Amino acid sequence: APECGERASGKRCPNGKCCSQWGYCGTTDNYCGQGCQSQCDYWRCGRDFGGRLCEEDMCCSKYGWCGYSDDHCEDGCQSQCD
Numbered sequence: 001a002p003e004c005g006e007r008a009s010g011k012r013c014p015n016g017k018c019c020s021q022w023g024y025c026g027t028t029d030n031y032c033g034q035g036c037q038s039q040c041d042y043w044r045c046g047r048d049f050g051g052r053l054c055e056e057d058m059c060c061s062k063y064g065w066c067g068y069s070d071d072h073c074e075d076g077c078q079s080q081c082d
């Protein structure tokens, strides 16, 4: 049964996860993409997003995306770079 969204009385997902248009929590494009009901910016971080820190100990790249690659953790990384 739905764990978030309108069929869950506006309930939000834990750890900032995206609530899909179908009412479930997750982090792939099916959850965070078009139709996403809430917390759709799970993968964004840094200066352009209220200085939010990434979950899962991910680095916040200079472009404001969360990840583990050298591109997200090296050169311009905003937080949790190591």
Ligand SMILES: CC(=O)N[C@@H]1[C@@H](O)[C@H](O[C@@H]2O[C@H](CO)[C@@H](O[C@@H]3O[C@H](CO)[C@@H](O)[C@H](O)[C@H]3NC(C)=O)[C@H](O)[C@H]2NC(C)=O)[C@@H](CO)O[C@H]1O
Residues within 6 Å of the ligand: 027, 028, 029, 043, 061, 062, 063, 064, 065, 066, 067, 071, 072
């Ligand atoms: C304005 C512009 O195009 N700027 C470029 C930056 O966007 C780009 O950073 C990378 O952007 C892509 C999306 O366009 C990021 O992919 C996302 O990564 C998350 C999790 O890491 C994943 O859930 C998304 O599905 C995925 N989207 C796609 C479309 O694959 C990618 O992580 C960003 N990389 C970094 C290091 O922040 C940078 C680097 O290529 O270049 C700018 O010109």
